[PDB]
Amino acid sequence: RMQIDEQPGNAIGAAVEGFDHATASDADIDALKSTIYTKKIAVLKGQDLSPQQFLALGKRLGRPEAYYEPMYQHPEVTEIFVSSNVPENGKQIGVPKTGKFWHADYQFMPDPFGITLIYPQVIPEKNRGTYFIDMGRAYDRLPEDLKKEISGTYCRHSVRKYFKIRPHDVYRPISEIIEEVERKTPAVVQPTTFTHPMTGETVLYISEGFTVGIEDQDGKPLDEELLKRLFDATGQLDESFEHDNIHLQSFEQGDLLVWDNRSLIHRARHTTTPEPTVSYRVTVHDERKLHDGI
Amino acid sequence: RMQIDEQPGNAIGAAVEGFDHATASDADIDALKSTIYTKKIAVLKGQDLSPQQFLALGKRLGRPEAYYEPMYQHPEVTEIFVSSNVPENGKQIGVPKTGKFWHADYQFMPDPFGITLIYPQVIPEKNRGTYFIDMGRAYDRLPEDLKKEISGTYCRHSVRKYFKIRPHDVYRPISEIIEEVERKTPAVVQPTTFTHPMTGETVLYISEGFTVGIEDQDGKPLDEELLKRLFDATGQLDESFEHDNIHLQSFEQGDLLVWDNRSLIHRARHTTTPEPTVSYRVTVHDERKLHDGI
Ligand SMILES: C[C@H](CC(=O)O)NCC(=O)O
Ligand SMILES: C[C@H](CC(=O)O)NCC(=O)O
Ligand SMILES: [Fe+2]
Ligand SMILES: [Fe+2]
Secondary structure (H helix, E strand, O other): OOEEEEOOOOOOOEEEEOOOOOOOOHHHHHHHHHHHHHHOEEEEOOOOOOHHHHHHHHHHHOEEOOOOOHHHEOOOOOOOEEEEOOOEOOEOOOEOOOOOOOEOOOOOOOOOOOEEEEEEEEOOOOOOEEEEEEHHHHHHOOOHHHHHHHOOOEEEEOOOOOOEOOHHHOOOEHHHHHHHHHHHOOOEEEEOEEEOOOOOOEEEOOOOOOEEEEEOOOOOEOOHHHHHHHHHHHOOOOOOOOOOOEEEEOOOOOOEEEEEOOOEEEEEEOOOOOOOOEEEEEEEEOOOOOOOOO | OOEEEEOOOOOOOEEEEOOOOOOOOHHHHHHHHHHHHHHOEEEEOOOOOOHHHHHHHHHHHOEEOOOOOHHHEOOOOOOOEEEEOOOEOOEOOOEOOOOOOOEOOOOOOOOOOOEEEEEEEEOOOOOOEEEEEEHHHHHHOOOHHHHHHHOOOEEEEOOOOOOEOOHHHOOOEHHHHHHHHHHHOOOEEEEOEEEOOOOOOEEEOOOOOOEEEEEOOOOOEOOHHHHHHHHHHHOOOOOOOOOOOEEEEOOOOOOEEEEEOOOEEEEEEOOOOOOOOEEEEEEEEOOOOOOOOO
8 A cells, every 4th residue: 555755856755655564565665765765765654563563674675784882772673773761661771862963874884774764662742853964965065166176085984973881881991992992993984975876866975973084085184174164065064953955854653764874964853851752773785885886 | 106117228118007097196297298208108007997087097197189070989988089899788889990000199180189098998819009100210210311301391191091981971972071071171281390399309290191292391292202202211111010110019908008199100900800909098288289380
């Protein structure tokens, strides 16, 4: 019964009714994926799933990868990444209020996955949602001088700013954790732009949260002001979130968000209050790498 | 009944018998302090003290200052800093295995105290002790080219390497803690050498743990190799601890160590094993600042 209702023209997003991951056909999945690659966000409606069913759904779209730090993992389905501030039997499950910064998922890793799935569990009614920027479209809207300046350049991405302290880190000297992070997840180099392997779009692959430097073709660093100007032009420095590149995606119970993790950067919008909020995440590799240079 | 038995000649240290902090006279305290300033380490023998009595003893020597991070504090006497890996009723008291790096206490703070007191509580029999270097004597033993090179220079000291993660830091992004530490305890500048206000000695006031840069009189940084050469010449890079500047101080139950926190740097020697070890610390300001430029 799957019906895809794409937003008109250039507007981002699509709504998907009648989707049952257990009965959807191969053609259903291919159509769904194609909507993800061209409309960037697919909101599956009326999803009422167990953790095992959410994983099964992600497995229809590609190969799931479990987040590399175990404290994020759901206790029954290790492939599920949990953002939660609601204890269960008094125990912290997952990590509170993940993602409160512009990023693409796994951008700081050598081999980022193409598709992110979010299944919200507990949703505040007030100021909850996810901000998105389409960095393909943000590239196209760059001034021509900036496009020329970044041609041929490379960016370095690192988790070093937003790596979250883990329970066993208590009482350790902070430099030991800083060095461990650099050792286990060293900064990764990507071309500043790449060609989206599904659509052919040019994507400006940077985020304020993870992108820490930009450099010329030899790997010689450039003034970080160049990075700051790219963040500013693309809307990532606008603390009011009114910039034209920014799309605010809300969601209601039963929604399941699936989105293009090559093209989009995003940032969790949370309440300014201690209100319960829980989301489950599955992240999958599709039929191609992030770009064909991987 | 206090009797001070100073080690002969130039050898470091003294033993103190018959000391009762509650009955010792003003002349006893003045003699004890003078031994601390000239012999650098005073081991008080046969001390059998409650936490309140240990604080009272420190108060005979000067004005106690409580460590600025509360997780180190003894639960009854906030002025007592606790190094402990032995839980009490299951609860972590103090901080495990503090000081496993060369430093002077509070060297990273604007106004370091002159006297450190250690009252060991649980002592492993095997490889336990405290390494010390007399940085006055280490200065005098520097080659003449090095003495000239550091003349007029300044060093910056920071807790940024060995600040210990606190329980409430769990799940925070690490950059937020890094920035908090820089904000609350910014790096402090001291002259590279100063005149010991009690003895007139020239002290080379650096430690591998806290000293992060050296700079000329204008505050222009110098090559950090200059700092590395000072650490190397003074014995702080010798991982075998056999260098001639190094003194290993052991202790037995009832010992109470009191030492010159202007002249000495030190480093905890712990077992290579998970063996119980507990020490209490009181730190006091005496009649003068660290040096007369404070
Ligand atoms: C550091 C972030 C997780 C978080 O915000 O806690 N990494 C998420 C990801 O890249 O998939
Ligand atoms: C960071 C150190 C404490 C420790 O080793 O945990 N400061 C001790 C002091 O300066 O008095
Ligand atoms: Fe994310
Ligand atoms: Fe110390």
